[PDB]
Design a binder for this molecule. Structure first.
Ligand code: HEC
Ligand code: HEC
Lengths: 53, 106
């Protein structure tokens, strides 16, 4: 819901978002699995873009 | 059994040309530290290049010239692919936020 409200159509208007008005779904990340296949293992993403800071 | 992803791989990097790799190596040799970075901090040029080979341009499966200018990796505008670079920076910030205050609660 946060992804939809902030990056798809921020303020209610699609033109300001960074996506082409494409709302997310559970399937977009989870491609049929309980852990997304494209998820990075811990310690592999640049520290500035991780959960630790 | 990729050491980065759970069930994904980028290894057959046929989408990256040889000139792109040569330019990457030359830029690494000529610049030990990054020249214009606003999001990726505390990393050398070699680490940034490794990230931009493995996860960026390996998660989209595109070439280094999709967002950059091969002659100068630090250039910001003047070529017809700058909007892609701007969107990519915004998508880096979004990912940081997303896994910083939503997957840190699990
Ligand atoms: C990409 C932004 C995702 C979206 C869209 C959805 N999920 Fe997800 N999910 C994502 C990650 C990176 C992880 C693992 C994080 C961790 O620290 O483990 C998950 C995990 C889950 C789980 C837990 C699975 C388990 O075995 O415990 C569940 C139950 C889950 N996610 C549910 C879920 C639902 C219902 C979604 C649609 C509303 C959904 N996720 C979307 C990444 C992403
Ligand atoms: C769009 C998805 C890109 C692809 C394809 C490649 N790169 Fe990239 N690069 C991108 C952005 C948005 C940035 C700026 C990061 C920031 O914090 O502002 C960069 C930056 C670099 C740098 C740093 C150079 C400098 O800042 O002076 C390097 C060395 C770099 N990128 C290398 C690189 C290589 C070798 C690529 C092909 C494998 C490549 N990038 C592709 C976005 C994108």
């Amino acid at each position: 819901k946060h992804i939809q409200e902030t990056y798809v159509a921020p303020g209610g208007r699609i033109a300001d978002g960074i996506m082409a008005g494409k709302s997310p779904s559970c399937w977009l990340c989870h491609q049929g699995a309980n852990i997304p296949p494209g998820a990075a293992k811990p310690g592999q993403v640049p520290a500035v873009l991780s959960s630790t800071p | 059994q990729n050491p980065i992803y759970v069930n994904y791989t980028q290894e057959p990097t046929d989408y990256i040309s040889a000139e792109s790799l040569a330019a990457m190596n030359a830029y690494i040799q000529a610049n030990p530290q990054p020249q214009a970075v606003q999001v990726l901090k505390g990393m050398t040029t070699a680490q940034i290049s490794a990230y931009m080979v493995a996860q960026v341009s390996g998660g989209l499966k595109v070439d280094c010239s999709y967002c950059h200018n091969i002659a100068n990796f630090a250039q910001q505008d003047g070529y017809p692919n700058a909007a892609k670079k701007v969107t990519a920076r915004k998508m880096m910030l979004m990912s940081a936020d997303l896994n910083q205050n939503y997957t840190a609660k699990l």
